[PDB]
Amino acid sequence: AATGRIVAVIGAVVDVQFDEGLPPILNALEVQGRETRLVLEVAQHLGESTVRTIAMDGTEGLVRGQKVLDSGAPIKIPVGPETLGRIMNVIGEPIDERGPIKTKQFAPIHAEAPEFMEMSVEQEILVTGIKVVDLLAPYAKGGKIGLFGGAGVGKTVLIMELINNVAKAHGGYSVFAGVGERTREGNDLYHEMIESGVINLKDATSKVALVYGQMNEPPGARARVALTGLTVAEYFRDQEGQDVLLFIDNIFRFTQAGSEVSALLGRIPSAVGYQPTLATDMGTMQERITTTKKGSITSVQAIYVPADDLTDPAPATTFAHLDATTVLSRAIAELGIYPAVDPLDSTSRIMDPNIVGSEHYDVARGVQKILQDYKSLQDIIAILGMDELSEEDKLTVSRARKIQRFLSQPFQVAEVFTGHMGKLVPLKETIKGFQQILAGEYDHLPEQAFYMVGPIEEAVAKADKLAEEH
């Protein structure tokens, strides 16, 4: 096809001048004369038969005038069941040293979002075994979830506990896309999925496909790897009808990489410093991760929050794309409460009495009401002390602290930190325990009897142990 010449190299932004046969936007171009395959994705047409492109790998060693070849199609990755148990990078090459991925078809990573007449409405609660999640913000089968959190508050531990519970109990070809995360964590996940039998290195019956572009990758790879994993999941949903799980961690890195290349594309910076096209990029990417009438994609996404802002344009823009947000807090994690989910900031769309039932709904609303009352009291509690509160106020503070402690839970993936064995509290135990703590059936137990327990039976047992030993 068409051949052109590099005319400018600035970071990950390469300008390529074609003499004839200009390539459409979003096409893939192969730089000629390199040891490893370097792919440039067309982003703009500058005129003068020049295009501007974003490089999917490093641009060092590139010389002005180097040959570039046009592929005639966007980045195409192999899609199919043969991707299960394999690791592939942003451009579909296997990075697990197990040979080529011999699939029958390749899909472009740029596609159109499903139409409005394909949207599905069904809303069925997805039980995760986590107390605060299943009580205050239940997830939904086939709904986008999203886990917001600052730096080091429990995003990856929570996403791995969700992986364990849901993905292991599942039967529908999970997919994991590591976007701008630690390569160490990717190796850990690969090997803990090899040992658990979810990835089968021989006699291939795997049920998870991994796609990884990590912190070490240039901005173009970190900006398109989410689309690559998204494409794998879209294949599993549409052309098989399967019920896919899709885990994305971390998806703020997509916006951040767009912001890193936006300056070099010559665009006036928006607010904060992000690209002017933040919301529409997030929309074109996030509207493809969706359940249709053809298949179901349960999408859990970790979302980094820069400097613990939550009003930074990237988290603020992500909020509108999710059905059940779970917001972790640093102030809570400094109290020792894990998972550090903020009870008064995590929402859900199925938190509706006509879906979860009046029992669940009323218990959740009461828990949130008592926690809100405690928060509003906290200021004069810490100024004057509790000795000045009303007796009803002392009761609301007591029950609120107890509910705080009961919301925490030891995680199976956190035995290395908690020392306790991981508990998986089913839904009715959660509802009943919290209903009882609300009613006042435990006004005599010490508050530390609820910290890091399973169901309320373990709380009463821990209280008995504390009372007898001490």
Partner: protein, 491 residues
């Protein structure tokens, strides 16, 4: 330097196709096509690319035209041919749109077939001036006690629903839409309110859920849903409110009463900021363009109540605004607060305290006020409002307990819009003193039981209060009758 000083134009200009009604793309990028030629094109004129895509000529520059693309630029290459169509944007309007879900250009997206309307209308039309209007008099019933009592909205008003994320703004708009079922199902033609819901920059799943909620409440056969979702090009999300406003202006100009909801305008401002920054227009505060107040203002000024010489129609606007961390001192919140006729401020702390709808009455306001209320709701609401203000300023034991009683009185569940007679019944029962003997946590149980009772037992009283609009002295005695009896029989 210079956009049209490219070597191609220059070379075959020195050496020697219609450049008046046709142009060529000099550069396409991020949905902004610079076009050389098109010397006859008008500002804001809709042009046509070779690939079937459309554009809007937003930047008439001395040597090129900055066109914003209505789609994906992967179908536009440099050197493509751009034709004129000679027209500004227009959308199909009429009665044939009720119950249909369209996009920002009036194309059906619910797969029920093409729209069968006969009239089209421009989207950039101007607002009615001083003379055609008349004072806002008729009440727009939201079926929400806090709104219809303390923040009343009239037909022709522009009431702002502002608040942080996940506080209940869409729920307020949807309850308002559902509530008009009692009026559109009757035959009294001048109380019917046709609704238009404009969804700007949302998920398609959210709009699907909303359409299902409206269909399960039978409130779609009189609703239009304009949907410019998150994946749609920024020009379409920018243009959706104007399409919806024209679809409602059809009803306004023809002696009918329309209600339009912009859900929400923050995302419309974001789309306009993107288009303007990519068109190299000088950024302002928070990188927003300088003419974004002009944007929201010329949009919202088209909601008016016409006088009887101009048909007597109306258009009521309920723009939605999302604040970041309760900060109304931002740019777009400042603008839209200064434009509208009052705001329904929803708080997050009030939401989790059980106060739902989480309306902050201390910060809410309605510049039309009691002029948009029926006489009965006025009689109860004056004293209710003053009661609550007195309570809040000292939030003396009588003030505190009465205020807590009223606060428990104002709670209301979702998707349950109450007719105005029952609202007046409740507020009467609560304000004249009959709830001072109840400890606040049972006020809800009371309200529920009392209204079951008054809808089962006293249909004639509610019917006469609906007929006349006020609490007649005989009906006043009958209200005291019923609430005294019930408070006796209550537990």
């Amino acid at each position: 330097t210079g956009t049209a000083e490219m070597s191609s134009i220059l070379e075959e200009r020195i050496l020697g196709v219609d450049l008046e009604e046709t142009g060529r793309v000099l550069s396409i990028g991020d949905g902004i096509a610079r076009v050389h030629g098109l010397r006859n094109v008008q500002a804001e004129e809709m042009v046509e690319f070779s690939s079937g895509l459309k554009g809007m000529s937003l930047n008439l520059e001395p040597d090129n035209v900055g066109v914003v693309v209505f789609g994906n630029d992967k179908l536009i290459k440099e050197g493509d041919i751009v034709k004129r169509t000679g027209a500004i944007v227009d959308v199909p309007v009429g009665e044939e749109l009720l119950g249909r879900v369209v996009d920002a250009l009036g194309n059906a997206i619910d797969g029920k077939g093409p729209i069968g309307s006969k009239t089209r209308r421009r989207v950039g039309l101007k607002a009615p001036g001083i003379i055609p209007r008349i004072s806002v008099r008729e009440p727009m019933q939201t079926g929400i006690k806090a709104v219809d009592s303390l923040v009343p909205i009239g037909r022709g008003q522009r009431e702002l629903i502002i608040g942080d994320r996940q506080t209940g703004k869409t729920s307020i708009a949807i309850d308002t839409i559902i509530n008009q079922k009692r009026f559109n199902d009757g035959s009294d033609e001048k109380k019917k309110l046709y609704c238009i819901y404009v969804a700007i920059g949302q998920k398609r799943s959210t709009v699907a859920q909303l359409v299902k909620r409206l269909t399960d409440a039978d409130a779609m056969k009189y609703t239009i849903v304009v949907s410019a979702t998150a994946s749609d090009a920024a020009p379409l999300q920018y243009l959706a409110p104007y399409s919806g406003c024209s679809m409602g202006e059809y009803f306004r100009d023809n002696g009918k009463h329309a209600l339009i909801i912009y859900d929400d305008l923050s995302k419309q401002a974001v789309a306009y900021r993107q288009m303007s920054l990519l068109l190299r227009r000088p950024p302002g505060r928070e990188a927003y363009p300088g003419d974004v107040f002009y944007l929201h203002s010329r949009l919202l000024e088209r909601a008016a109540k016409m006088n009887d010489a101009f048909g007597g129609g109306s258009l009521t606007a309920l723009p939605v605004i999302e604040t970041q961390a309760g900060d109304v001192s931002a740019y777009i919140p400042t603008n839209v607060i200064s434009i509208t006729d009052g705001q329904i401020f929803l708080e997050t702390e009030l939401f989790y305290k059980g106060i739902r709808p989480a309306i902050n009455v201390g910060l809410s306001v309605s510049r039309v006020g009691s002029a948009a209320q029926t006489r009965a709701m006025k009689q109860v609401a004056g004293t209710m409002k003053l009661e609550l203000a007195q309570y809040r300023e000292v939030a003396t034991q009588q003030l505190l307990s009465r205020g807590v009683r009223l606060t428990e009185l104002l709670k209301q569940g979702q998707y349950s819009p109450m007719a105005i007679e029952e609202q007046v019944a409740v507020i009467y029962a609560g304000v004249r003193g009959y709830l001072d003997k109840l400890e606040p946590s049972k006020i809800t149980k009371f309200e529920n039981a009392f209204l079951s009772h008054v809808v089962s037992q006293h249909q004639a009283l509610l019917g006469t209060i609906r007929a006349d609009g006020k609490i007649s002295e005989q009906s006043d005695a009958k209200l005291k009758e019923i609430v005294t009896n019930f408070l006796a029989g209550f537990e």
